[PDB]
Amino acid sequence: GWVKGVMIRCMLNIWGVILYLRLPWITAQAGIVLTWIIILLSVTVTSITGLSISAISTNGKVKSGGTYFLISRSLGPELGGSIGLIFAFANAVGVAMHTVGFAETVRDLLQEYGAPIVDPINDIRIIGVVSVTVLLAISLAGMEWESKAQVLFFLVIMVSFANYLVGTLIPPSEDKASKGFFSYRADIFVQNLVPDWRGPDGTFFGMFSIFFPSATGILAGANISGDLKDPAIAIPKGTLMAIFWTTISYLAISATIGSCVVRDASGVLNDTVTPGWGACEGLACSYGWNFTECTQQHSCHYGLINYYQTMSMVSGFAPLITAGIFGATLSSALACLVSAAKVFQCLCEDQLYPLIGFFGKGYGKNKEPVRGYLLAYAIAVAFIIIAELNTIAPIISNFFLCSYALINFSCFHASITNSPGWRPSFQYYNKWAALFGAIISVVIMFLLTWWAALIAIGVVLFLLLYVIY
Amino acid sequence: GWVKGVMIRCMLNIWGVILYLRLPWITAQAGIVLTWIIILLSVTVTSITGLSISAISTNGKVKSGGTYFLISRSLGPELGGSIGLIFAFANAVGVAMHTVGFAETVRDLLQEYGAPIVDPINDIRIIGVVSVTVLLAISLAGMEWESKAQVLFFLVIMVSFANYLVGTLIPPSEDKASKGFFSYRADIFVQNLVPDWRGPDGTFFGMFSIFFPSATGILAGANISGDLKDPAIAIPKGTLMAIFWTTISYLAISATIGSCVVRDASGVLNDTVTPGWGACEGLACSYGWNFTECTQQHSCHYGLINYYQTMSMVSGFAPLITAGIFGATLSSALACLVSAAKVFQCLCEDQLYPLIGFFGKGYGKNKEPVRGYLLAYAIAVAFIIIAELNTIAPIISNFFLCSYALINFSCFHASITNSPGWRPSFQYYNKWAALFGAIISVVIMFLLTWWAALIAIGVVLFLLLYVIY
Ligand SMILES: CCCCCCCC/C=C/CCCCCCCC(=O)O[C@@H](COC(=O)CCCCCCCCCCCCCCC)COP(=O)([O-])OCC[N+](C)(C)C
Ligand SMILES: CCCCCCCC/C=C/CCCCCCCC(=O)O[C@@H](COC(=O)CCCCCCCCCCCCCCC)COP(=O)([O-])OCC[N+](C)(C)C
Ligand SMILES: CCCCCCCC/C=C\CCCCCCCC(=O)O[C@@H](COC(=O)CCCCCCCCCCCCCCC)COP(=O)([O-])OCC[N+](C)(C)C
Ligand SMILES: CCCCCCCC/C=C\CCCCCCCC(=O)O[C@@H](COC(=O)CCCCCCCCCCCCCCC)COP(=O)([O-])OCC[N+](C)(C)C
Ligand SMILES: CCCCCCCC/C=C\CCCCCCCC(=O)O[C@@H](COC(=O)CCCCCCCCCCCCCCC)COP(=O)([O-])OCC[N+](C)(C)C
Ligand SMILES: CCCCCCCC/C=C\CCCCCCCC(=O)O[C@@H](COC(=O)CCCCCCCCCCCCCCC)COP(=O)([O-])OCC[N+](C)(C)C
Ligand SMILES: CCCCCCCC/C=C\CCCCCCCC(=O)O[C@@H](COC(=O)CCCCCCCCCCCCCCC)COP(=O)([O-])OCC[N+](C)(C)C
Ligand SMILES: CC(C)CCC[C@@H](C)[C@H]1CC[C@H]2[C@@H]3CC=C4C[C@@H](OC(=O)CCC(=O)O)CC[C@]4(C)[C@H]3CC[C@]12C
Ligand SMILES: CC(C)CCC[C@@H](C)[C@H]1CC[C@H]2[C@@H]3CC=C4C[C@@H](OC(=O)CCC(=O)O)CC[C@]4(C)[C@H]3CC[C@]12C
Ligand SMILES: CCCCCCCCCCCCCCCCCCOC[C@@H](O)COP(=O)(O)OCC[N+](C)(C)C
Ligand SMILES: CCCCCCCCCCCCCCCCCCOC[C@@H](O)COP(=O)(O)OCC[N+](C)(C)C
Ligand SMILES: CCCCCCCCCCCCCCCCCCOC[C@@H](O)COP(=O)(O)OCC[N+](C)(C)C
Ligand SMILES: CCCCCCCCCCCCCCCCCCOC[C@@H](O)COP(=O)(O)OCC[N+](C)(C)C
Ligand SMILES: *[C@@H]1O[C@H](CO)[C@@H](O[C@@H]2O[C@H](CO)[C@@H](O)[C@H](O)[C@H]2NC(C)=O)[C@H](O)[C@H]1NC(C)=O
Ligand SMILES: *[C@@H]1O[C@H](CO)[C@@H](O[C@@H]2O[C@H](CO)[C@@H](O)[C@H](O)[C@H]2NC(C)=O)[C@H](O)[C@H]1NC(C)=O
Ligand SMILES: [Cl-]
Ligand SMILES: [Cl-]
Ligand SMILES: [Cl-]
Ligand SMILES: [Cl-]
Ligand code: NA
Ligand code: NA
Ligand code: NA
Ligand code: NA
Numbered sequence: 009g010w011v012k013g014v015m016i017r018c019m020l021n022i023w024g025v026i027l028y029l030r031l032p033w034i035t036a037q038a039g040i041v042l043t044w045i046i047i048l049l050s051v052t053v054t055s056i057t058g059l060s061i062s063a064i065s066t067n068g069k070v071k072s073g074g075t076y077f078l079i080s081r082s083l084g085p086e087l088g089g090s091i092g093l094i095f096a097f098a099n100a101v102g103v104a105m106h107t108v109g110f111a112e113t114v115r116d117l118l119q120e121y122g123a124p125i126v127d128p129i130n131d132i133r134i135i136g137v138v139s140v141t142v143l144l145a146i147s148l149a150g151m152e153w154e155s156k157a158q159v160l161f162f163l164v165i166m167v168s169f170a171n172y173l174v175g176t177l178i179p180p181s182e183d184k185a186s187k188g189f190f191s192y193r194a195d196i197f198v199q200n201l202v203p204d205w206r207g208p209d210g211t212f213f214g215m216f217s218i219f220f221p222s223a224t225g226i227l228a229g230a231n232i233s234g235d236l237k238d239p240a241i242a243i244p245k246g247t248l249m250a251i252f253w254t255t256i257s258y259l260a261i262s263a264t265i266g267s268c269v270v271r272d273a274s275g276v277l278n279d280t281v282t283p284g285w286g287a288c289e290g291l292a293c294s295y296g297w298n299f300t301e302c303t304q305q306h307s308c309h310y311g312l313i314n315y316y317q318t319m320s321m322v323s324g325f326a327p328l329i330t331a332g333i334f335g336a337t338l339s340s341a342l343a344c345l346v347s348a349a350k351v352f353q354c355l356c357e358d359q360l361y362p363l364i365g366f367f368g369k370g371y372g373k374n375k376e377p378v379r380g381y382l383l384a385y386a387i388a389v390a391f392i393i394i395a396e397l398n399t400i401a402p403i404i405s406n407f408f409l410c411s412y413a414l415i416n417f418s419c420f421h422a423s424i425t426n427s428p429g430w431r432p433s434f435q436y437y438n439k440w441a442a443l444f445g446a447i448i449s450v451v452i453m454f455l456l457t458w459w460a461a462l463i464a465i466g467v468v469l470f471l472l473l474y475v476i477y
Numbered sequence: 478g479w480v481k482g483v484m485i486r487c488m489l490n491i492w493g494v495i496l497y498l499r500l501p502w503i504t505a506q507a508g509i510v511l512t513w514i515i516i517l518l519s520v521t522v523t524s525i526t527g528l529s530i531s532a533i534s535t536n537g538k539v540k541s542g543g544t545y546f547l548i549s550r551s552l553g554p555e556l557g558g559s560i561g562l563i564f565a566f567a568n569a570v571g572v573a574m575h576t577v578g579f580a581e582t583v584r585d586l587l588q589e590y591g592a593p594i595v596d597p598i599n600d601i602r603i604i605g606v607v608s609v610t611v612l613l614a615i616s617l618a619g620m621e622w623e624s625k626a627q628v629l630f631f632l633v634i635m636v637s638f639a640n641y642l643v644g645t646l647i648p649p650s651e652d653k654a655s656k657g658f659f660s661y662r663a664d665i666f667v668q669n670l671v672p673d674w675r676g677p678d679g680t681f682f683g684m685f686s687i688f689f690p691s692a693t694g695i696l697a698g699a700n701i702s703g704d705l706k707d708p709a710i711a712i713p714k715g716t717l718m719a720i721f722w723t724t725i726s727y728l729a730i731s732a733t734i735g736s737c738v739v740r741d742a743s744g745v746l747n748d749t750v751t752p753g754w755g756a757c758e759g760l761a762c763s764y765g766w767n768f769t770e771c772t773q774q775h776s777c778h779y780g781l782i783n784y785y786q787t788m789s790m791v792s793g794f795a796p797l798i799t800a801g802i803f804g805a806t807l808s809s810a811l812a813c814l815v816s817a818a819k820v821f822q823c824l825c826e827d828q829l830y831p832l833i834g835f836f837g838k839g840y841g842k843n844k845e846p847v848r849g850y851l852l853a854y855a856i857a858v859a860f861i862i863i864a865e866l867n868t869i870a871p872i873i874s875n876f877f878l879c880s881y882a883l884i885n886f887s888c889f890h891a892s893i894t895n896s897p898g899w900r901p902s903f904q905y906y907n908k909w910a911a912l913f914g915a916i917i918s919v920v921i922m923f924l925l926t927w928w929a930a931l932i933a934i935g936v937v938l939f940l941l942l943y944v945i946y
Binding site: 424425451454458459462477 | 893894920923927928931946
């Protein structure tokens with residue numbers, strides 16, 4: 009069908025690490041208004057790309073084809089090959105991002121039980137490489153039950169959302185109030201409406217580059233093609249509904265975490281305001297909490313802007329949100345891993361590039377891209393060695409923005425030149441909308457960082473001109 | 478011929494304002510080694526572009542001449558039309574830069590002799606507007622004295638160079654020693670071999686963006702291909718010889734000004750060393766001068782890094798170098814203005830763009846582009862309103878780097894796709910050298926500043942795709 013076929017597995021790929029780990033932090037540094045602006049600006053790009061993908065899907069009656077097959081048969085081989093290569097690399101790095109998020113969650117779990125391995129960052133590296141190896145092992149042999157693991161992942165994420173909302177509704181406990189979360193309060197909402205840039209990554213585009221991986225994952229709907237009853241109707245509805253619902257979830261979580269947790273807090277339970285005259289400051293002082301020492305000293309360990317795991321603390325039952333993080337990360341990383349490998353294998357089936365034709369060999373009876381799986385695993389491990397979401401996320405934002413700009417401009421190019429095999433039937437496709445989407449995607453790509461955007465653009469130009477020549 | 482027709486024409490357009498006003502200051506902030514590296518890196522781009530230009534001039538046989546005509550007939554309507562518009566805009570801004578340099582020289586002359594008009598920056602604006610109006614009046618009516626003007630300008634620049642080199646060897650007087658000039662000394666050479674990096678523009682690429690317009694002007698030989706004797710053998714040798722000799726002049730001036738003047742000095746003549754047990758701190762102490770007061774407070778008025786007219790101070794007779802600055806700036810500004818107007822008119826006569834076609838008609842009997850002259854004058858005035866050379870220069874570096882990258886990549890594209898017309902006979906043209914030149918030009922363009930490079934590439938892509946579609 010369309011619901012479970014497209015929208016449920018597009019949500020599972022869109023929801024990932026930044027939903028649970030960095031969205032509260034983005035809402036802390038930027039304002040609620042600025043976080044909403046970031047979310048809507050990412051969703052504009054992803055929705056224009058979704059319209060382009062819907063136009064691609066409703067083009068002809070292409071059967072049994074992945075993302076690369078659809079794009080390269082509806083559009084030209086010159087643009088299709090570059091789109092496939094950039095998309096495969098972006099998914100390979102997204103594997104590293106989601107594995108790093110899962111490893112960070114496991115490392116925090118280990119720390120809370122007081123059993124760390126070596127040290128914060130190296131523990132993340134070890135857990136991430138072990139996780140990604142287990143992910144590769146599952147992807148190679150044992151993916152038959154991923155059709156039933158999808159329901160478990162979706163139900164786990166739903167339970168995590170419900171638990172977070174229920175815990176947010178609960179009035180504060182002493183420990184939670186000490187950690188910064190009191191409750192829905194107008195004063196905290198007004199305080200968090202305005203930006204507060206507090207680090208090296210504190211900037212509007214610095215937070216856009218970290219958030220934007222939250223919006224990617226719409227092309228996961230494209231590679232379903234061939235397992236759908238009616239792609240021309242299933243693909244657009246599923247993709248656009250998933251984009252809309254994940255956008256609603258991001259906005260709701262941002263506006264609800266910005267209205268109940270203060271930016272600065274100290275995990276010390278003694279900071280409860282002592283009776284007397286006092287010189288206590290801060291918004292929390294009105295709720296009996298004197299977090300004055302850490303706020304001025306800039307040595308706070310908790311709060312929205314300091315604690316990277318505030319959704320877990322706020323929720324009524326912390327392990328449920330940890331399970332939700334595990335489900336979201338292991339769904340998104342697996343989807344990216346088995347998307348990059350399949351796109352790369354299909355691309356290597358087409359003798360379009362000189363050196364990448366070795367990775368196009370299948371293994372077993374399902375012709376699975378074992379060589380592509382190993383290359384994606386190697387790239388994922390290499391980017392995992394970084395072991396920092398705030399550094400890996402800007403790379404993935406750059407490469408997914410490049411892929412989306414490429415898709416939008418390729419659709420525009422096919423429309424404006426009146427390509428022989430480009431007669432999309434999607435009602436809401438406009439070539440000028442696609443051009444606007446590609447232009448804004450490139451502008452944002454250069455705005456996040458200029459050198460990586462230039463590298464991606466140069467790679468795209470090299471591939472496109474090589475196929476042209 | 479090739480000497481006066483081509484090489485001297487390219488000489489007078491390459492030699493400009495940065496040679497007299499900012500090269501000693503670039504040598505002060507970046508040191509002699511990095512200034513030479515900047516000069517050689519700019520000359521690499523300009524010589525690789527000159528090889529492509531020489532290949533264009535030897536391709537087929539064109540009798541009418543003109544930069545845009547040659548490039549478009551040898552390379553195609555799309556690439557040729559993009560080049561003929563970016564180059565025209567770059568030449569229009571070059572008029573603003575050279576007029577601003579002339580206005581700055583006149584403002585300094587007014588300050589030293591007489592009284593200023595309104596304000597040191599507003600005086601630059603007023604003098605620049607008046608001088609560019611006079612240049613426009615000369616261009617519209619009175620363009621028959623050009624051979625005499627070329628001879629006078631070349632002779633005055635030769636006299637300025639000779640007088641500077643003669644006064645540099647002269648042992649320093651009390652005033653010159655106070656201002657920081659101590660003839661030739663190894664200690665000053667060693668001290669100035671290393672960077673200083675003061676001010677907001679202290680940067681390797683910040684200095685490259687200001688120096689680079691000193692290397693542009695290599696397209697003056699191709700402008701008169703029709704009016705030559707044998708372009709296929711005159712344009713290449715003339716362009717390459719002009720590039721080589723101007724490179725030699727820049728390297729020599731940088732090396733001798735680095736080894737003569739200290740970075741920090743005070744115009745006060747009382748700053749001679751007192752005969753006692755003092756606390757003298759600078760290198761000039763060994764030469765008998767005490768510049769500690771301003772050097773420690775960063776309030777020195779003179780020196781290599783503080784005085785923009787130290788080249789005139791060092792020389793034997795300042796008025797000769799003032800005349801040399803006037804000649805160089807006026808020759809370069811006139812060449813840029815007439816080249817922009819003539820390229821724009823020829824581009825507009827070929828109906829490749831919708832609205833520019835209005836600036837395509839000539840006036841009088843020789844069909845001068847009066848509308849093109851007025852548009853170039855308007856752009857020049859708009860950029861003159863910015864009365865800072867260090868602000869206009871990075872813009873011209875960006876646009877001339879874009880033009881040179883476009884020419885190089887257009888030649889490479891015509892070579893690789895085996896274009897029909899494209900059959901260059903130049904012995905030293907290689908398509909891979911052109912590709913390297915285009916790539917490094919784009920990389921440098923983005924390294925100077927990323928947003929202006931992005932705007933230039935966006936305009937280039939817009940024009941190219943408009944002609945393609
Ligand atoms: C893309 C962005 C930069 C990054 C580039 C990354 C790649 C760089 C490396 C490139 C060299 C690639 C290998 C060449 C050697 C192997 C042969 C081969 O590949 O086939 C062909 C090359 O293949 C191509 O077409 C490459 C095209 C690169 C385009 C780069 C454009 C940069 C524009 C920047 C400015 C844009 C405009 C700016 C305007 C302001 C060559 O075939 P051949 O050998 O000629 O055939 C026989 C002839 N011969 C043997 C006698 C010679
Ligand atoms: C690697 C990942 C990223 C890849 C993509 C990277 C970005 C690539 C972006 C490329 C953008 C290229 C835009 C120009 C070329 C297409 C439009 C055009 O001008 O041709 C058209 C002329 O149209 C006009 O000239 C009138 C003005 C409207 C169109 C141009 C607006 C955008 C201008 C530039 C703005 C962007 C400047 C910066 C970007 C260059 C020809 O067709 P038409 O006559 O319009 O026909 C109308 C048909 N209709 C009647 C059905 C409507
Ligand atoms: C979904 C669309 C995208 C956007 C959605 C964004 C939606 C949310 C956006 C913003 C919510 C944030 C604004 C309200 C918070 C600040 C104001 C406030 O509430 O203050 C009051 C509490 O309010 C309550 O008791 C309940 C409030 C929230 C109920 C649940 C929120 C929706 C949860 C469902 C998830 C969302 C729905 C999804 C459902 C599918 C308390 O005020 P005070 O300061 O204590 O009073 C002062 C008195 N004193 C001074 C005397 C002490
Ligand atoms: C096959 C083709 C491509 C593959 C090539 C791979 C090349 C591999 C090379 C490098 C790969 C690794 C990059 C460096 C990692 C740097 C990390 C870093 O911190 O950088 C820092 C700087 O860094 C730079 O600014 C330099 C950027 C390098 C140029 C990229 C060349 C490739 C373009 C391809 C061709 C294009 C053609 C275009 C066509 C239209 C960021 O710092 P900043 O912000 O500058 O700091 C200023 C601070 N301030 C302002 C506050 C004072
Ligand atoms: C084709 C050209 C290729 C080259 C281009 C670049 C060429 C120019 C490049 C470099 C030349 C300039 C830099 C080196 C010399 C100054 C630095 C120095 O070392 O000071 C020393 C040398 O000083 C002199 O040599 C003075 C006499 C010649 C000065 C230069 C004349 C013009 C050179 C260009 C003419 C035009 C060239 C082009 C014509 C077309 C003096 O120091 P000292 O204190 O006396 O030493 C005492 C040491 N002790 C105290 C320990 C005992
Ligand atoms: C393909 C060819 C056509 C298209 C080309 C691509 C289009 C764009 C082409 C060129 C634009 C490139 C960027 C320009 C702005 C740079 C920033 C700047 O210098 O601001 C200056 C504004 O100076 C003033 O005081 C007001 C006068 C500004 C006149 C120029 C405005 C642009 C108009 C003509 C351009 C459009 C002409 C369009 C013609 C069709 C002030 O300087 P600052 O940086 O703020 O401060 C620096 C420190 N400082 C204070 C000491 C100085
Ligand atoms: C057809 C038309 C196309 C052209 C449209 C014209 C648009 C005209 C819009 C603006 C022109 C006028 C001047 C703009 C700003 C000047 C002021 C300034 O100093 O900016 C500041 C930066 O901020 C930016 O980065 C601006 C970036 C957006 C401009 C590029 C968008 C246009 C791209 C085109 C589309 C391409 C798609 C194609 C790619 C393949 C300078 O800051 P910095 O120092 O440099 O940054 C670091 C500063 N720091 C010191 C704090 C660290
Ligand atoms: C980063 C941001 C600034 C991106 C900017 C995108 C623009 C370059 C695009 C977006 C929508 C485009 C427009 C969409 C619709 C049209 C109408 C079109 O005219 C038609 O022939 C059909 C419509 C009509 O009848 O006018 C001409 C192109 C134009 C103006 C397009 C010009 C280019 C626009 C403004
Ligand atoms: C001093 C340095 C730092 C200046 C900048 C480097 C250039 C001098 C280099 C960089 C890339 C080089 C080019 C890269 C590739 C080629 C292809 C090469 O092709 C051939 O050999 C063609 C003849 C044949 O072998 O059949 C000729 C040299 C050339 C143009 C190179 C010439 C020298 C270039 C421009
Ligand atoms: C906050 C910073 C960003 C602010 C943007 C605000 C929020 C945007 C969130 C994204 C929504 C953007 C979606 C894309 C909108 C532009 C895209 C608009 O949709 C394209 C339109 O073409 C669709 O309509 P058609 O082209 O066919 O014409 C209509 C067909 N009917 C109606 C005749 C049947
Ligand atoms: C703030 C915490 C974030 C939580 C806020 C946002 C809520 C998260 C977003 C989740 C929104 C919900 C997504 C789930 C899908 C909603 C959107 C549903 O999509 C359309 C359905 O009608 C299709 O479903 P079915 O054909 O299965 O019919 C269902 C009815 N029967 C068949 C079972 C009887
Ligand atoms: C100080 C560092 C300097 C860096 C600058 C280097 C600058 C560029 C190289 C410089 C000097 C050039 C040396 C001499 C001038 C070129 C001299 C070589 O060119 C002779 C030209 O007339 C024509 O080239 P050809 O003679 O090979 O053939 C012409 C075309 N037809 C007849 C076959 C059709
Ligand atoms: C096949 C193509 C492959 C790539 C080819 C070449 C790649 C090598 C290029 C990298 C060399 C550059 C290394 C970067 C050096 C350190 C890079 C340090 O970054 C500084 C520059 O990005 C910016 O300089 P500015 O911002 O000062 O310029 C003027 C703007 N202001 C003054 C107004 C602020
Ligand atoms: C709340 O706690 C803060 C912690 O800084 C108190 O601030 C300090 O108070 C003591 C005096 O009793 C001294 O350390 C200084 O007066 C303050 N130092 C700093 C670092 O601010 C504050 O007095 C407390 N206010 C109450 C009682 O609510
Ligand atoms: C070189 O100049 C410095 C700076 O003026 C002199 O050092 C100062 O000497 C006078 C008188 O002793 C006082 O202003 C201070 O004691 C010194 N420092 C400053 C910052 O002024 C130094 O004496 C001079 N050396 C000479 C003339 O040989
Ligand atoms: Cl995510
Ligand atoms: Cl995606
Ligand atoms: Cl110059
Ligand atoms: Cl030039
Ligand atoms: Na995602
Ligand atoms: Na997920
Ligand atoms: Na010049
Ligand atoms: Na000149």
